[PDB]
Design an enzyme around this catalytic site. Structure first.
Site, short mmCIF file in Angstrom:
data_model
loop_
_atom_site.label_atom_id
_atom_site.label_comp_id
_atom_site.label_asym_id
_atom_site.label_seq_id
_atom_site.Cartn_x
_atom_site.Cartn_y
_atom_site.Cartn_z
N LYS A 157 31.30 32.20 -1.96
CA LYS A 157 30.75 32.55 -3.26
C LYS A 157 29.73 33.70 -3.21
O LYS A 157 29.22 34.04 -2.13
CB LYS A 157 30.20 31.29 -3.96
CG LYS A 157 31.35 30.32 -4.30
CD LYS A 157 30.94 29.23 -5.29
CE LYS A 157 32.12 28.36 -5.66
NZ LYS A 157 31.64 27.12 -6.33
N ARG A 188 34.69 21.71 -0.31
CA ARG A 188 35.82 22.43 -0.83
C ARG A 188 35.81 23.83 -0.26
O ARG A 188 34.99 24.64 -0.65
CB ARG A 188 35.72 22.46 -2.36
CG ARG A 188 36.80 23.30 -2.99
CD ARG A 188 36.77 23.24 -4.51
NE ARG A 188 37.86 23.94 -5.16
CZ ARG A 188 37.82 25.23 -5.44
NH1 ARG A 188 36.79 25.94 -5.06
NH2 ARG A 188 38.82 25.83 -6.08
N1 LIG Z 1 34.97 20.85 -7.79
C1 LIG Z 1 34.81 22.18 -7.71
N2 LIG Z 1 33.68 22.69 -7.12
C2 LIG Z 1 33.49 24.03 -7.04
O1 LIG Z 1 32.42 24.50 -6.48
C3 LIG Z 1 34.44 24.89 -7.55
N3 LIG Z 1 34.27 26.23 -7.46
C4 LIG Z 1 35.24 27.04 -7.99
C5 LIG Z 1 35.14 28.54 -7.90
N4 LIG Z 1 34.20 29.19 -8.77
C6 LIG Z 1 33.48 30.25 -8.30
C7 LIG Z 1 32.22 30.44 -8.85
C8 LIG Z 1 31.40 31.47 -8.44
C9 LIG Z 1 31.84 32.35 -7.47
C10 LIG Z 1 30.92 33.48 -7.05
O2 LIG Z 1 29.76 33.55 -7.53
O3 LIG Z 1 31.32 34.31 -6.22
C11 LIG Z 1 33.13 32.17 -6.91
C12 LIG Z 1 33.95 31.12 -7.31
C13 LIG Z 1 36.38 26.50 -8.58
N5 LIG Z 1 36.55 25.17 -8.65
C14 LIG Z 1 35.60 24.35 -8.14
N6 LIG Z 1 35.76 23.00 -8.20
#
Ligand SMILES: Nc1nc(O)c2nc(CNc3ccc(C(=O)O)cc3)cnc2n1
Ligand SMILES: Nc1nc(O)c2nc(CNc3ccc(C(=O)O)cc3)cnc2n1
Lengths: 265, 265
Positions: free
Chosen positions: A211, A245
């Site tokens: 992230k 995850r």
């Molecule tokens: N249960 C669960 N838990 C998570 O943490 C999650 N994250 C994402 C992905 N979302 C992101 C958010 C922010 C960023 C960035 O700032 O780079 C990247 C990906 C998708 N499903 C998810 N499901």
């Protein structure tokens, strides 16, 4: 410590024995289909097998887009993966209809990034099929009085929604929602105080993989975030989280497993 | 938190700002020399530059073998590295004479795996040059009443030896001695209870890099121990350690740095 197992139809996930790795199935679509074309469905299946051979315990599958369009994309993937790979599948959606279709198509866990707040009916869907639902912390603003206290308050609102639709305690899982509705410094602050989430009495999933807050700390692009992801996974396991995850299953499984041995899990 | 800096002659190490990476200089000898031959001295120097460009803050240099033979090998390395690389050098020996020669040759920190117990005169050497000495926990048996309590007791014996020779509190650093005098399961138990070492009031160095207890946990050979090493470094930083001693500087620096940001160091 947990006096039950996580029941996912044909599979059981023990919560006491090891940290559980949820692998993030990658879903490159074919530009020409909306369907379940051969190149994409096969790319997914191969990726799922790779993560399984690497140590993943759950495969997480995700599909601005319409309900019918998200279902077309995601159902053939769940079908092919559930048949060809022997691990429970989580469906990464916030839509009650998507969730229904996915479970019918073979999905075992609901993975909701809006924590049943976008479409409360999703909690009804989970309540009926008797599946685990992951309630992730999220909101439409970054205005916190006290980040941790508010996160817990907001997660509690999701629990109320889930419970009021008949979701059993044993099928509630919580997630702090790293990278959602938080500045980078707020992300780091939730990591630092993650153990507070345990007072709510539910297993916690941590998703930090690759992230941007890691990029913010290390000044590195997404493909360079493996060491910093492992740092989060480790501190996550030290603070009591039950699942992580992650994209890089091989590397994170090894880290998890070393952590477990040290912490005595 | 620490109300002083680590003084190493021309270099200062701040203990509050970040976790400090001690890079483990590799010392492949030329089969034909005992001396400071061109192939070995140059292999070392290049390796030292690599670790510096990777984020190391100290270079750790080590030489059944005689005193004069260990000095012949190690002095040319300290000389070449101290001149060509701008970071403090620790000399990894338990011998008072080796330690003298190394400091004279340009070494800034004494790194003693016997914690001044093999050759108590080493503490005199450190006391005179006014350098930091790292007192590592060690013993000639594995018979613990209570592993942690004994480790602390044994380390306290090293402190008494160091202090009785005039070593100032500010030049004492402690190390739990992972992989020495402990079974694998005892190694894991020290990791788990590492924070107890802090009651002694000294900065702690953790060295776990690639050690066999990681192999024991993950069932992987030495060259496959990077993820499990990072797990230890992370749990180490979470439990308050100030230095880590690692082979893979690039990877561990990134982990350390991510840890620091999360823990608020
Ligand atoms: N249960 C669960 N838990 C998570 O943490 C999650 N994250 C994402 C992905 N979302 C992101 C958010 C922010 C960023 C960035 O700032 O780079 C990247 C990906 C998708 N499903 C998810 N499901
Ligand atoms: N200060 C300090 N701190 C250490 O931790 C250390 N470790 C070694 C290396 N020793 C070992 C021991 C055990 C093992 C194995 O079981 O594999 C490997 C290497 C050398 N100098 C050291 N100096």
């Amino acid at each position: 410590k947990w006096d039950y197992d996580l029941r996912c139809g044909e599979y059981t996930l023990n919560l006491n024995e090891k940290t559980l790795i949820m692998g993030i199935l990658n879903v490159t679509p074919d530009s020409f289909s909306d369907g379940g074309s051969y190149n994409e469905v096969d790319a997914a299946v191969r990726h799922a097998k790779e993560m399984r051979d690497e140590g993943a315990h759950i495969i997480d599958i995700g599909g601005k887009v319409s309900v019918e369009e998200e279902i077309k994309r995601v159902v053939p993937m769940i079908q092919a993966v559930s048949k060809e790979v022997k691990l429970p599948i989580s469906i990464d959606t916030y839509k009650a209809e998507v969730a229904k279709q996915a479970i019918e198509a073979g999905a075992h866990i609901i993975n909701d990034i809006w924590g049943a707040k976008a479409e409360p009916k999703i909690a009804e869907v989970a309540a009926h099929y008797d599946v685990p639902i992951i309630l992730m912390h999220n909101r439409d603003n970054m205005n916190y009085r006290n980040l941790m206290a508010d996160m817990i308050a907001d997660l509690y609102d999701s629990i109320k929604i889930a419970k009021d639709a008949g979701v059993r305690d044993e099928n509630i899982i919580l997630d702090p929602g790293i990278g959602f509705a938080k500045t980078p410094e707020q992300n780091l602050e939730a990591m630092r105080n993650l153990e507070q989430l345990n007072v709510l009495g539910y297993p916690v999933l941590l998703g930090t993989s690759r992230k941007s807050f890691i990029g913010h700390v290390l000044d590195l692009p997404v493909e360079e975030r493996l060491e910093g992801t492992g740092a989060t996974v480790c501190l996550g396991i030290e603070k009591g989280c039950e699942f992580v995850r992650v994209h890089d299953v091989k590397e994170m499984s090894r880290m998890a497993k070393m952590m477990d041995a040290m912490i005595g899990k």
